[PDB]
């Protein structure tokens, strides 16, 4: 109990107690309640909740029996601070389905219905704290919450478990308890009215009207109860929240256009409308509930006018009137302490950066620390501290994650250009440097020093074998920084490493599968997903590796010499095709998909593709042009089709994209003397549209004021491509000539 | 054994909870069922045409999906349509290029039903009819992304990257559903003994047998399971089998048409089956081989039996239901010289020889219906000696005619079942609804107009169809409709009681039947005469809200002969009497139309 | 396999007895039934051929 009190309402204490979770990961109701309090009202831990915990609790429920504590824990885990977790919902539903009928029990049978009635009448006054009825209610609520997510299979399974016949038989029964009514109404609202199924039996069934008339009877009971001071909070809250919610959801969907056909349905609608009118007339209704009631009444009114139902004139004028009406020293010491704290934090901002800078510098020159002529000084002169640091970084990859991350980060800052932090920061750095120690050329020299030291081996061993996303990202950044500037020696060392190394396929395998997951996430999606963000570093790393027209590296990337061969260029083309929408985008719908968020990634992908093609490389050119996915068309669609959404409020990006696409096409046809490339590109490129966009670029040049890339060179590049293409197209040659 | 090349025709066994070939119901039904009672691997089902699937490569439907959404601004729609057309043509080009390649475990394949020409697609956004938790599996002609299926190894012997071998067991996992196909144990209410195939987690193994190779699927060959007609060159007549006096008889029909080849009838359609060691294997037929002939209309096998007249001939041809006897095996001999023993070319004259009795088929000039005016049936019998002049050309039939015949045969079967049920005197609401659905479907089929949700008792047709009308008449469907119209008034329902709501559905049913009797009699004289043969029944029921008067007027609208025969004092008196009762202008209009015909 | 060539290594095969014309097969009957945690499974030959057993 004390632990529950201590970890309630404060995320910090909740996480601190959750750190020692091995104590509560054991059978016991009290432990389950305590851990439920630990994972209550917080989203960080719930989102990152490990699958084994849920699996163990499901197995516990299956083995030790049915209890409500575990169901309550699952319900709390599903919803955190008002936002559901898709992952947790998925694992919970899968585990429940795989558990079997023992864990999940539904009283949908005649005998089971009689048992439900017996349990209900046994708890007529109120639901007991622990009883099978509570377990059923909790299970129904959990299933409804899980079905709230957008998963078709889960909704189908929920519908199969509880057919509409069961809910009408139980809810509409002569005697029904409030808890079951609320749970079943919520289940219907979150599993029947709102679904991705096309059949949607609810919208084309008379059962929902039976539910509606039952709800009207319930509201009549509520009003009569208050008239006689027999107010029941459960009935009031049920009618106020769930009855109105389900009524609004059913009557607001656009698929109920033809549902209202029977005059009896119209009478039920009138009864519901006057029911809401009676509800708003009384002053007991609360302001927050008044808003929901008014909204439901509005929706019902739009439905009524749309159906042109002839309501009674007196109440019809009444509903019109309502529609028009609604339309219309201790504290002082604390604050002073906070002020001083923020002031000190602002003041000390540059000094810390200077201290990290001196750390990097000291690491760069460890020899000065020792004395001249000492054996340790000789060791540091030729490698030494840096060699041991790099060598041991791989060893401590698993022992300490934070230490490895920090070592990689400081190594990255070592290769970065120097910068000034300020007068005070510079002075502090000078003092620390003197006390402790007594252009592109420098960056290249440092990169070569790391190359000799063994940095390439460290980074390669990190990418090939690392289960931590942060370490992989830092390793990729280190590779980028080492390759920055198109060094011709780091690339050679990297190529030697891949060619002569037992791992071989492992590094390319992790790169390849990461790219595959990236395209899968992009396809599923259509901010940005975590999977797509990591794609920019990988593309930049590949482009830098193949920079300066390194033929051997391009050939190796296209196809390795190992037993298992993985290509990265074709995956890059496929990824661009998927991101751009494929055929549908190239047809003219490309502009809709492209937005400001993903423009930079597309630019980087195009840059990498043109770097692959350049050199020139024939094999890469044939692979890209003759790809199975037919991605090349999108490259053409970039220049032919103007991005209607982005062009209105962002032009520089559009011109940059067009320029990159033109460069990529020119690189594809840099030294192609055959005709297959010409025919393939011409199929997508309509000559008339090509010349038209050429003229459009000329006349559009006027906007050079706000764009650093002038439309003139993009137009000129397109014309150069047209000249290269006209060699195999007589019509294009004729059109390309001047008037 | 051999690899499963793309294009081969296979049969998918359903070993697991329920074992049986995955067949599909006829008509517009898009439901696939595995029926274990029909047969097993050793004994195949009698109707071995609904269990054949062709394996096809990947087919992209992105632009097609977008076009469908656009259908369910004009320049954009036109561009999308052009996109769908170019994407389709790219699809066929890729399919032709990839044809002949082997299939590997973990690859992507689509199953196309040869009979229905519909892909076996799986829909994840709909639950199954009988198993809610299981997602839908149905046949779609155009296909969608659900048609994609991974073939995976049910055995540990085969791994990803290996080549599939015929006769093995595999698992079919749809690309989107991610749930293997399962043959549930939920029997379908509509058809007894038929289970349901749904995409859901299970452990069923789909043993992939082999029926035809990719190389043997050439259209220039007489392939096993093909359907052809046996034209007689000397007598210029088509071989036919028909019900005559309670027993089916095989004969040579005579026609008065100037061109004998134009006497095309659905009863003369025969299917050729190559007898191989494997019961479930067909393939191209060779000159040195044994063949069997099946009748699509009735499912009977041609054979020879002792002739009581033993006339000059010893045995006579006859239809036999069973096909496992040795009396149904026939060898085909060529009439010209052929290079070695190669595949039998299509549209080539051949001679049929019986294996058991070593006798050669021969025509005879003795009519069987001697007690009938204008004999049209000529007896056929086998003579021990060989006659060179007697050869039977094997003429191919267009696939369309087969499709209409398959549509009509099942419909006739269920109409006959409904007629028998009505004759018994008991019927259920579900059965009545099913028969109503059948009647409207038949109306649409006869009209041939696409279904746009118009009134069932109101449809416009510009060009009546002749071949469909002939198929409608000669499959006894019109006779079954007449039985449906006549049997109820014999009493389950009464004419005056049709107004009452209790019998309201029956009245509607009858209207449909009358409409079924209206489209058939349009520009075709034989159908008009056949329907008019029972003019008494239509006259008896005229007056009630059954549309009998409209059918009669249409029947006699153009044909003068029936106009004089079926119009006399009595019927005009009945028209006057019902005019006096109803006092409605429509009957006056009908009389005015009857007054003058053909302007 | 192409013709009758050498048996490749690491290849699945089925064993058949010459004398009795029977095919080897696994069985789910432990031999040490009088012993906790049976680990030995009986093997026997069935006249019919099972493809899954390799
Ligand atoms: O041109 P008309 O006046 O209609 O007459 C045609 C023909 O003279 C026969 O009556 C009949 O052929 P059969 O000798 O085979 O009966 C044919 O129908 P068919 O299409 O059923 O052959 C008719 O269409």
Swiss-Prot record, chain C:
Belongs to the InsP3 receptor family. Expressed in intestinal crypt and villus epithelial cells. Phosphorylated by AKT1 on serine and/or threonine residues. Inositol 1,4,5-trisphosphate-gated calcium channel that, upon 1D-myo-inositol 1,4,5-trisphosphate binding, transports calcium from the endoplasmic reticulum lumen to cytoplasm, thus releasing the intracellular calcium and therefore participates in cellular calcium ion homeostasis. It is linked to Charcot-Marie-Tooth disease, demyelinating, type 1J: An autosomal dominant demyelinating form of Charcot-Marie-Tooth disease, a disorder of the peripheral nervous system, characterized by progressive weakness and atrophy, initially of the peroneal muscles and later of the distal muscles of the arms. Charcot-Marie-Tooth disease is classified in two main groups on the basis of electrophysiologic properties and histopathology: primary peripheral demyelinating neuropathies (designated CMT1 when they are dominantly inherited) and primary peripheral axonal neuropathies (CMT2). This is Inositol 1,4,5-trisphosphate-gated calcium channel ITPR3. Composed of a large N-terminal cytoplasmic domain (CD) followed by a juxtamembrane domain (JD) and a transmembrane domain (TMD). Residues 4-54 form the MIR domain. It is found in: Endoplasmic reticulum membrane; Cytoplasmic vesicle, Secretory vesicle membrane. It comes from Homo sapiens (Human). Homotetramer. Homodimer. Interacts with TRPC1, TRPC3 and TRPC4. Interacts with TRPV4. Interacts with SIGMAR1. Interacts with PML and AKT1. Interacts with IRAG2 (via coiled-coil domain). Interacts with CABP1. Interacts with TMBIM4/LFG4. Interacts with CEMIP. Interacts with TESPA1. Interacts with TMEM203. Interacts with BOK; regulates ITPR3 expression. Interacts with BCL2L10. Interacts with CHGA and CHGB.
């Amino acid at each position: 109990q004390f632990l529950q009190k201590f970890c309630a309402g404060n995320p910090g204490n909740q996480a601190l107690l959750h750190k020692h979770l091995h104590l509560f990961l054991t059978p016991g109701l009290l432990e389950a309640e305590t851990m439920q309090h630990i994972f209550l009202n917080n989203y960080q831990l719930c989102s990152e909740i490990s699958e084994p915990v849920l699996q163990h609790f499901v197995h516990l429920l299956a083995t030790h029996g049915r209890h409500v504590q575990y169901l309550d824990f699952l319900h709390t885990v599903i919803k955190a601070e008002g936002k559901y977790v898709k992952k947790c919902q998925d694992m919970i539903m899968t585990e429940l389905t795989n558990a079997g009928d023992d864990v999940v029990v539904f009283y949908n049978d005649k005998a089971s219905l009689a048992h439900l009635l017996d349990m209900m009448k046994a708890a007529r006054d109120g639901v007991e704290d622990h009883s099978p009825l509570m377990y059923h209610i909790s299970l129904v609520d959990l299933l409804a919450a899980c079905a709230e997510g957008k998963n078709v299979y889960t909704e189908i399974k929920c519908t199969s478990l509880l057919p509409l016949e069961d809910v009408v038989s139980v809810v509409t029964h002569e005697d029904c308890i409030t808890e079951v009514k609320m749970a079943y109404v919520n289940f219907v609202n979150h599993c029947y009215v709102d679904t991705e199924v096309e059949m949607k039996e609810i919208y084309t069934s008379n059962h929902i009207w039976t539910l509606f008339e039952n709800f009207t009877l319930d509201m009549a009971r509520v009003c009569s109860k208050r008239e006689k001071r027999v107010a029941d909070p459960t009935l009031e809250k049920y009618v106020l929240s769930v009855v109105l919610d389900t009524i609004n959801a059913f009557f607001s969907s656009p698929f109920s256009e033809n549902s209202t056909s029977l005059q009896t349905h119209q009478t039920i609608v009138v009864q519901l409308l006057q029911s809401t009118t009676r509800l708003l007339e009384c002053p007991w209704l609360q302001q927050q509930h008044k808003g929901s009631v008014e909204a439901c009444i509005r929706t019902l009114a739009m439905v009524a006018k749309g159906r042109a139902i002839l309501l009674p004139m007196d109440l019809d004028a009444h509903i019109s009137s309502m529609l028009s009406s609604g339309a219309s020293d201790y504290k002082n010491i604390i604050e002073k302490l906070q002020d001083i704290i923020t002031a000190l934090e602002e003041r000390l901002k540059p000094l810390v950066q200077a201290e990290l800078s001196v750390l990097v510098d000291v690491l760069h020159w460890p020899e000065l620390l020792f004395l001249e002529g000492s054996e340790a000084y000789q060791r540091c002169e030729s490698g030494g501290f840096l060699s041991k640091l790099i060598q041991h970084t791989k060893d401590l990859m698993e022992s300490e994650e934070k230490l490895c991350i920090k070592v990689l980060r400081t190594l990255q800052q070592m290769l970065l250009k120097k910068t000034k932090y300020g007068d005070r920061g510079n002075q502090l750095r000078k003092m620390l440097l003197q006390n402790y120690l007594q252009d592109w050329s420098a960056i290249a020299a440092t990169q070569c020093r790391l190359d000799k030291e063994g940095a390439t081996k460290l980074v390669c061993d990190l990418i090939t074998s690392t289960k931590n996303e942060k370490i992989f990202q830092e390793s990729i950044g280190l590779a980028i920084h080492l390759l920055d500037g198109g060094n011709t020696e780091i690339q050679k060392s990297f190529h030697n490493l891949m060619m002569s190394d037992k791992k071989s396929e492992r590094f390319f395998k992790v790169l390849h599968d990461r790219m595959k997951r990236a395209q899968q996430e992009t396809k599923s999606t259509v901010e940005m997903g975590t999977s797509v963000l990591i794609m920019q570093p990988i593309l930049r790393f590949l482009q830098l590796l193949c920079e300066n027209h390194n033929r051997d590296l391009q050939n190796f990337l296209r196809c390795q010499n190992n037993k298992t061969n993985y290509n990265l260029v074709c995956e890059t083309l496929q990824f661009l095709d998927i991101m751009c929408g494929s055929t549908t985008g190239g047809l003219g719908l490309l502009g809709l998909y492209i937005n400001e968020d993903n423009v930079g990634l597309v630019i980087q992908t195009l840059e990498t593709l043109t770097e692959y093609c350049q050199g020139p490389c024939h094999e890469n050119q044939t692979c890209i042009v003759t790809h199975e996915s037919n991605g090349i068309d999108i490259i053409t669609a970039l220049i032919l089709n103007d991005i209607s959404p982005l062009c209105k409020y962002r032009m520089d990006l559009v011109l940059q994209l067009k320029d990159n696409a033109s460069k990529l096409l020119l690189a594809l046809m840099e030294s192609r003397h055959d005709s297959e490339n010409a025919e393939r590109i011409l199929i997508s490129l309509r000559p008339q549209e090509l010349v038209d966009v050429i003229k459009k670029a000329y006349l559009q040049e006027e906007e050079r004021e706000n764009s650093e890339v002038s439309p003139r060179e993009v137009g000129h590049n397109i014309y150069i491509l047209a000249l290269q293409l006209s060699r195999h197209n007589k019509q294009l040659q004729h059109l390309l000539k001047p008037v | 054994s051999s690899f499963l090349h793309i294009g081969d025709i296979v049969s998918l066994y359903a070993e697991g909870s329920v074992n049986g070939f995955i067949s599909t119901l006829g008509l517009v039904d898009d439901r696939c069922v595995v029926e274990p009672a029909a047969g097993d691997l050793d004994n195949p089902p009698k109707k071995f045409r609904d269990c054949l699937f062709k394996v096809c490569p990947m087919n992209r439907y992105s632009a097609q999906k977008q076009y469908w959404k656009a259908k369910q601004d004009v320049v954009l729609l036109q561009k999308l349509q052009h996109a769908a057309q170019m994407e389709q043509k790219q699809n066929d080009t890729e399919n032709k290029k990839v044809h002949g390649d082997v299939v590997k475990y973990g690859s992507v394949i689509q199953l196309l039903h040869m009979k229905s020409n519909k892909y076996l697609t799986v829909n994840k956004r709909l639950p199954a009819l009988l198993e809610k938790n299981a997602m839908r599996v149905t046949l779609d002609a155009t296909g969608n992304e659900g048609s994609w299926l991974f073939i995976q190894p049910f055995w540990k012997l085969r791994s990803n990257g290996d080549n599939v071998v015929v006769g093995d067991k595999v698992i079919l996992n749809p690309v989107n559903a991610g749930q293997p196909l399962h043959a549930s144990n939920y029997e379908l209410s509509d058809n007894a003994g038929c289970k349901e195939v749904n995409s859901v987690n299970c452990n069923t193994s789909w043993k992939i047998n082999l029926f035809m190779q990719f190389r043997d699927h050439l259209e220039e060959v007489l392939k096993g399971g093909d359907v052809v007609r046996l034209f007689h060159a000397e007598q210029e007549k088509f071989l036919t089998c028909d019900e005559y006096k309670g027993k089916l008889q095989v004969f040579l029909r005579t026609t008065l048409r100037q061109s004998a080849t134009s006497a095309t009838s659905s009863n003369a359609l025969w299917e050729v089956e190559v007898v191989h060691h494997d019961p479930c294997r067909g393939g191209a037929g060779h000159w040195n081989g044994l063949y069997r002939f099946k009748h699509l209309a009735t499912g009977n096998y041609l054979a020879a039996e002792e002739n009581p007249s033993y006339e000059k001939i010893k045995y006579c041809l006859v239809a036999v239901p069973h096909g496992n006897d040795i009396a149904s095996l026939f060898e085909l001999d060529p009439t010209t010289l052929q290079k070695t023993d190669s595949f039998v070319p299509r549209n080539s004259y051949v001679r049929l020889r019986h294996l058991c009795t070593n006798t050669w088929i021969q025509s005879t000039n003795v009519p069987i219906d001697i007690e009938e005016e204008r004999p049209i049936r000529l007896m056929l019998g086998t003579c021990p000696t060989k006659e060179d002049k007697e050869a039977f050309a094997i003429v191919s039939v267009p696939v369309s005619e087969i499709r209409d015949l398959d549509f009509a045969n099942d419909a006739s079967s269920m109409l006959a079942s409904a007629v028998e049920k009505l004759n018994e005197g008991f019927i259920s609401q579900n059965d009545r609804r099913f028969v109503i659905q059948l009647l409207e479907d038949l109306v649409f089929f006869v009209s041939d107009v696409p279904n746009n949700g118009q009134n069932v008792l109101d449809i416009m047709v510009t060009k009546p169809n002749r071949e469909r009308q002939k198929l409608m008449r000669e499959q006894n469907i019109l006779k079954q409709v007449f039985g449906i119209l006549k049997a109820p008034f014999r009493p389950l329902v009464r004419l005056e009681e049709l107004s009452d709501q209790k019998n309201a559905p029956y009245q509607h049913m009858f209207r449909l039947c009358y409409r079924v009797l209206r489209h058939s009699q349009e520009d075709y004289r034989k159908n008009q005469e056949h329907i008019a043969k029972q003019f008494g029944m239509m006259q008896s029921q005229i007056g009630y809200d059954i549309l009998a008067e409209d059918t009669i007027t249409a029947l006699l609208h153009n044909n003068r002969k029936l106009l004089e025969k079926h119009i006399t004092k009595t019927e005009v008196e009945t028209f006057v009497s019902l005019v006096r009762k109803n006092r409605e202008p429509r009957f006056l209009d009908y009389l005015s139309d009857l007054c003058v015909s053909n302007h």
